[PDB]
Amino acid sequence: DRRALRIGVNGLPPSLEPINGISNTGPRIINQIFDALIRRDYFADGAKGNNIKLVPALAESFERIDDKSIRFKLRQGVKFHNGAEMTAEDVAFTFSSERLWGDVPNGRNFSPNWDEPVVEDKYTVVLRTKTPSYLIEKYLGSWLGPIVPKEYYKSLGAVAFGNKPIGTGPYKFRELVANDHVTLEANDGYWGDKPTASTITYQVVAEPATRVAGLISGEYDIITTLTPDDMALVDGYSDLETRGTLIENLHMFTFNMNQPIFQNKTLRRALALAVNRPLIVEALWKNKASIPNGFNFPHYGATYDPKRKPMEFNLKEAKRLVKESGYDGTPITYHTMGNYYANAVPALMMMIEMWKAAGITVVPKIFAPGTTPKDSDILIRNWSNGQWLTDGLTTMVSEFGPGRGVQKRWGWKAPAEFNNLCDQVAQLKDGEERSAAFNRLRDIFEDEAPAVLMYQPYDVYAARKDVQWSPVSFETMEFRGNLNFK
Numbered sequence: 001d002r003r004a005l006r007i008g009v010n011g012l013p014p015s016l017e018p019i020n021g022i023s024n025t026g027p028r029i030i031n032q033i034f035d036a037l038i039r040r041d042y043f044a045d046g047a048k049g050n051n052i053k054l055v056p057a058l059a060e061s062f063e064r065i066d067d068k069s070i071r072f073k074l075r076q077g078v079k080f081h082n083g084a085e086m087t088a089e090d091v092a093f094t095f096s097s098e099r100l101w102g103d104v105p106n107g108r109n110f111s112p113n114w115d116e117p118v119v120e121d122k123y124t125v126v127l128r129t130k131t132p133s134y135l136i137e138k139y140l141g142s143w144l145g146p147i148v149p150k151e152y153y154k155s156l157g158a159v160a161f162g163n164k165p166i167g168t169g170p171y172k173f174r175e176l177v178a179n180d181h182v183t184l185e186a187n188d189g190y191w192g193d194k195p196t197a198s199t200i201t202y203q204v205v206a207e208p209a210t211r212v213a214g215l216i217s218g219e220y221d222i223i224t225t226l227t228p229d230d231m232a233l234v235d236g237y238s239d240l241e242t243r244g245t246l247i248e249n250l251h252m253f254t255f256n257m258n259q260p261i262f263q264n265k266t267l268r269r270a271l272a273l274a275v276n277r278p279l280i281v282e283a284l285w286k287n288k289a290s291i292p293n294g295f296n297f298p299h300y301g302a303t304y305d306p307k308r309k310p311m312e313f314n315l316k317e318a319k320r321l322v323k324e325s326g327y328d329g330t331p332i333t334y335h336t337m338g339n340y341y342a343n344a345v346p347a348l349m350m351m352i353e354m355w356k357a358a359g360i361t362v363v364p365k366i367f368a369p370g371t372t373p374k375d376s377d378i379l380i381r382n383w384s385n386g387q388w389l390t391d392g393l394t395t396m397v398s399e400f401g402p403g404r405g406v407q408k409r410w411g412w413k414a415p416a417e418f419n420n421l422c423d424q425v426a427q428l429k430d431g432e433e434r435s436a437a438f439n440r441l442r443d444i445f446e447d448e449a450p451a452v453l454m455y456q457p458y459d460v461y462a463a464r465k466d467v468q469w470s471p472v473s474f475e476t477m478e479f480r481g482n483l484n485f486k
């Protein structure tokens with residue numbers, strides 16, 4: 001009776017464990033298998049997929065009890081896909097030190113300074129931080145929020161769980177063939193709205209042209225990760241149409257600052273100032289992508305500055321910084337996994353011409369999916385950052401802050417003021433002091449260039465008109481109240 005939904009995707013996450021799966025590819029599957037305590041209701045009050053409104057989901061209700069603690073009263077009788085009941089012990093294990101120190105390597109890095117949860121009774125749990133945090137609600141309504149089954153997860157382990165996941169969500173896991181496909185089936189025991197698809201298959205078609213062809217042949221219902229130039233060919237078919245939105249993600253490139261050439265900021269800044277981002281955005285994105293003024297976005301709220309000035313493209317100063325660095329003309333690789341990111345390779349080719357004008361030789365190192373390149377082989381690599389809280393702390397603090405990946409793993413030796421301001425904004429209410437501390441972090445980041453911010457992508461999907469689904473302003477696919485078949 002219900003139609004089978006087929007989605008052609010750019011890739012699959014390494015795992016379906018909610019934290020390990022954090023990437024451009026995981027949420028669109030994880031969002032279907034799991035629910036969090038709080039859900040971002042993208043379409044609430046007439047919004048077109050961009051509403052920040054957080055509403056209770058596995059939590060029937062909640063109350064903030066002090067500046068570091070929230071008491072959650074859970075929905076009763078909700079079942080995981082294996083029959084076990086969702087209780088306070090599952091929620092406590094989800095945000096426990098045992099689960100978040102998985103060796104799940106980024107559980108600790110993305111999380112606030114959680115104190116241990118308190119199970120007050122079967123359906124009541126207090127989630128709390130060791131220091132004051134006014135962001136707890138936002139953290140529990142984000143991609144960190146999915147609730148996992150304690151006993152099943154403990155018996156399997158994080159990675160085996162990530163291959164056979166069990167959650168409470170509208171679609172249950174059926175099968176996975178690594179780097180090929182994931183198939184989910186409707187959970188007719190779902191506590192929320194009835195799932196409208198019989199099955200949902202996510203099938204990897206790494207090349208966009210082959211993926212557009214699949215939609216025309218009728219092998220796919222929806223396809224992901226297209227560019228604004230693909231819209232003309234697709235929209236020509238009366239049966240098909242494109243659906244796009246400006247998402248809360250940033251396309252960027254970053255450096256292995258352990259490498260001697262990038263241990264200092266001089267050549268990082270030359271590589272940053274030589275990029276003419278408005279020309280790339282015009283030529284490849286039809287001006288649909290948006291250049292931000294540092295890590296600065298409308299969904300941040302009180303920490304968004306509309307009047308902030310952008311970083312200027314300056315070839316003259318980039319040439320002078322190249323000369324100043326002593327750069328001897330060694331070709332620098334730029335690792336890119338094909339077009340995992342929309343317009344990744346055409347943007348790199350344009351930037352190579354801009355870097356050549358500055359006197360820098362950058363060569364592409366296109367690597368196939370499945371090839372996990374070693375850290376030592378990386379010089380420049382592309383990346384993206386999902387701005388995953390409706391707040392300024394993510395991703396300037398969460399990715400580039402003290403003790404986290406960019407500084408520890410990739411060796412960015414950040415200034416003292418930056419790291420102190422990162423700690424201060426975690427324990428600080430919105431207002432005048434917080435807003436200026438974020439514009440100070442933005443100024444330091446611009447001067448050090450541990451990464452270069454390209455643009456906020458205009459995320460383009462394509463679909464059959466007989467599949468009623470609207471994209472959301474994030475790197476996921478929401479089908480709750482947003483998936484009908486004509």
Ligand SMILES: O=P(O)(O)O[C@@H]1[C@@H](O)[C@H](O)[C@@H](CO)O[C@H]1O
Binds near residue numbers: 022024384387475
């Ligand atoms: O760009 P990919 O690697 O698919 O996913 C990134 C994550 O690596 C990153 O940790 C997260 C938050 O910054 O944003 C994603 O979009």
